[PDB]
């Protein structure tokens, strides 16, 4: 803090377009003739945008005196994140979160004669497990020199207001960072190819395309909220069900404005041609083809583990250091429905899911695996099964039944692949599942 | 780690003159004969001055033990600032002090013929401004190893007294530094030649010189306190008046010791020979010929901005750090009377003052300037005026009238120069002002 | 205890300081080499043997 700034013009970062002063002066029947009768239109023109640096100016009457500052104003701002309503509870102690899902079973036929030797036969349930771990640890650092900051203020109220604004800046930064972190999750999920993809033409090309997108969204929501459920909209391929009141559609402002200008302001019975679930508007996604994302309330699995503030004082320098530490867990659940609604170029098959992903079997035994292909078209894609564990005597039938030999003891990997490319241009989509064996 | 000393003799800090120990051993009829009947005079002469380092002294009863300390005494002193009575108040918020002084005007000749056209004429008042700023920021640092010092003191009271002594030493340092800064103010003011110089002889050279100095001071005080005022005693050449109760005279101890033993004891009616105003004694000044200073109570303009103390603890080193921060603004007012009685050779002209320090004129106006030359002797000197603006058309006449050309845009400086040297080595004293140009 | 940093620091400081001092002082005086271990240094020992 040293006041040495001499000969600074009030034109630092300004690149004028047409020099309003000359435009007004050389006006003969132009649009600027309105400003001709103004007595002082040059000082206003040259000062009305504000000046970044001020200099001491003497008084008009007595040049010994200096003009002084009459008013000082301090601006305040408060920023929030509209996704905060998606946050889950709090986990003070712990690092990981465990998620368990149980699936439906199969029906057998009643046979009393065969029931007299299979009373104690057992049939294990179908259970799937998912894990999440804490993945964000950060802090914000600020310093305040209260004693050295007293020469710039005349009123204790203004001094306190400035200090309060400095403190609030940390919270604003934390809110912005939290919003960015939460919005990165959808882009990461789309980049991993775990969304269920619905192909649309374009939300902006034509009103017909926009209304086709609306129709597709309504059909998808109706299919999602069915009492019997469906294993077609979750990455784990489990028979699950969703409720209409828990469905959230995230779109952007351009799409919202185009929709309510084109299809809502010109349609009678507007309730039959609009969105169904809860509607959220953000500032667009980072993905190329993403237009609108339809998710379940339980899709978000974000938790906060630490939120604390610590202050230290320097006696030699007379200043306070403030540290704001934030620790969080950011992840999403694969047991909930999630639709992407892509409008660009989409491959024929997005992923292949093998229903048993981890399984432990004995030295000699058979295990059945099922595969689901997420195709974006109505075409049927065949699935090729293989196992590569490096052991001789184990083999997988084309139906996905793997029989393991007891001669060797090592981990096995099971692959179900499809070919979505053309001849001489093999494009492969592979779904992997690992098998352990007990000796 | 163990601070120890070996092979130490009690003569490192003693410079013997005649070795009284040996002198009193062999004396016949001398003045030392009074000390011969003393039995243990050798020990008294040996350790009369004290011992700097406590050697391990064996006990008399048993020579295989250690000796304790009979008594520990803590010496405490307090140092004050004799000039503290000249302090002004405190400035919690702000950095700058503005001082405004309005001067007298000139009488005009009555005329009714010219009163018909100049009824709405303007006559700007003569005002002057002075500025002071916060210019001292310092701190005192002291470390105390309380855990390392408790084990070295038998009693808790001794340790408490030691800590109190350290704090008192910090405060004494602050007081001494403040006194030195206040003296440095006067030394700097004399260095810049802003005092009103008065030539005297050396007061201690002779009683005639002492009484001449007394007469000169009394005359100067009367002139300063004259009711009509004068502009020959202040650095801004402004018409001002002083009161006898606000005049402070600063001298040294030698002059005070000389006066009362030379003139005050010899002569009756001590009020007709002693000093007039308030008199304070210091340990001289740093200047070469400066002998006395007579200033007004408002001459000092020292204010306090900050005074605080902070402490920190080091767990690893087991000590406390104390920081004592003092922030002050130190300045003097040029509107107050300030004369300096100096003995020796002084220049004929000390400074030249231009009455309008800053002026603002248009491209057709004229400005009148007044010059005041501070001359020690009664010799008359002639001033020469010049303008260092750098442009043409703008010029100043010999009587101090500056005229500005019709077209000119740069900052002008008006200089008044006095030549006091001789040929082949001219000596110039110049006073200048600043002029700004309106469009 | 963990509601805020001030209480956390106060609790941890008091606990570690007082409990550690007391416990270590009472457990270091029961070591096998305790018969050579005397208490605090006596006042006025005079560091001299008679």
Curated annotation (Swiss-Prot), chain C:
It is found in: Virion. Transmembrane segments: none annotated. Disulfide bonds: none annotated. Assembles to form a prolate capsid shell of about 54 nm in length and 45 nm in width, with a T=3, Q=5 symmetry. Belongs to the phi29likevirus major capsid protein family. Homohexamer. Homopentamer. The prolate capsid is composed of pentamers and hexamers of the capsid protein. This is Major capsid protein. It comes from Bacillus phage phi29 (Bacteriophage phi-29).
């Amino acid at each position: 803090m040293r006041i040495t700034f001499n000969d600074v013009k009030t034109s630092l970062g300004i690149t004028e377009s047409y020099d309003i002063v000359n435009a007004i002066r050389n006006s003969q029947g132009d649009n600027f003739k309105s400003y001709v009768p103004l007595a002082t239109a040059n000082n206003v023109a040259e000062v009305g945008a504000g000046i970044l640096i001020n200099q001491t100016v003497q008084n008009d009457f007595i040049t010994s005196l200096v003009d002084r500052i009459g008013l000082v104003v301090i601006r305040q701002v408060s920023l929030n994140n509209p996704l905060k309503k998606f946050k889950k509870g709090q986990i003070p102690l712990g690092r990981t979160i465990e998620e368990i899902y149980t699936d439906i079973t199969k029906e057998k036929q009643y046979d009393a004669e065969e029931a007299e030797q299979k009373v104690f036969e057992r049939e294990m349930p179908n259970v799937k497990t998912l894990f999440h771990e804490r993945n964000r640890q950060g802090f914000y650092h600020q310093t305040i020199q209260d004693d050295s900051l007293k020469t710039a203020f005349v009123s204790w109220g203004n001094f306190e207001s400035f200090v309060s604004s400095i403190i609030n800046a940390i919270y604003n930064s934390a809110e912005v960072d939290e919003y960015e972190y939460m919005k990165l999750l959808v882009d990461n999920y789309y980049s991993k190819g775990l969304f269920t993809t619905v192909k649309i033409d374009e939300p902006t090309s034509s009103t017909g395309a926009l209304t086709e997108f609306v129709k597709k969204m309504r059909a998808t929501a109706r299919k999602l909220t069915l009492p019997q459920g469906s294993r077609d909209w979750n990455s784990m391929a489990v028979r699950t069900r969703s409720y209409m009141e828990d469905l959230h559609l995230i779109i952007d402002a351009d799409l919202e404005a185009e929709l309510d200008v084109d299809v809502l302001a010109k349609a009678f019975n507007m309730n039959r041609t609009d969105f169904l679930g809860n509607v959220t508007v953000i500032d667009g996604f980072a993905s190329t083809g993403l237009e609108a994302v339809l998710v379940d309330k339980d899709w978000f699995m974000v938790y906060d583990n630490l939120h604390k503030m610590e202050t230290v004082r320097n006696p030699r320098g007379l200043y306070w250091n403030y540290y704001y530490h934030v620790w969080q867990t950011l992840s999403v659940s694969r047991f909930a429905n999630a639709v992407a609604f892509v409008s660009g170029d989409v491959p024929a098959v997005t992923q292949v899911i093998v229903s048993p992903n981890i399984a432990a079997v004995k030295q000699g035994g058979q295990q059945q695996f099922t595969a689901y292909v997420r195709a974006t078209n109505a075409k049927d894609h065949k699935v090729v099964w293989s196992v590569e564990g490096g052991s001789t005597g184990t083999a997988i039938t084309g139906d996905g039944l793997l029989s393991v030999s007891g001669n060797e003891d090592n981990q096995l990997t099971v692959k179900a692949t499809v070919d979505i490319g053309t001849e001489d241009k093999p494009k492969l989509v592979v779904g992997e599942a690992v098998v352990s064996i007990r000796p």
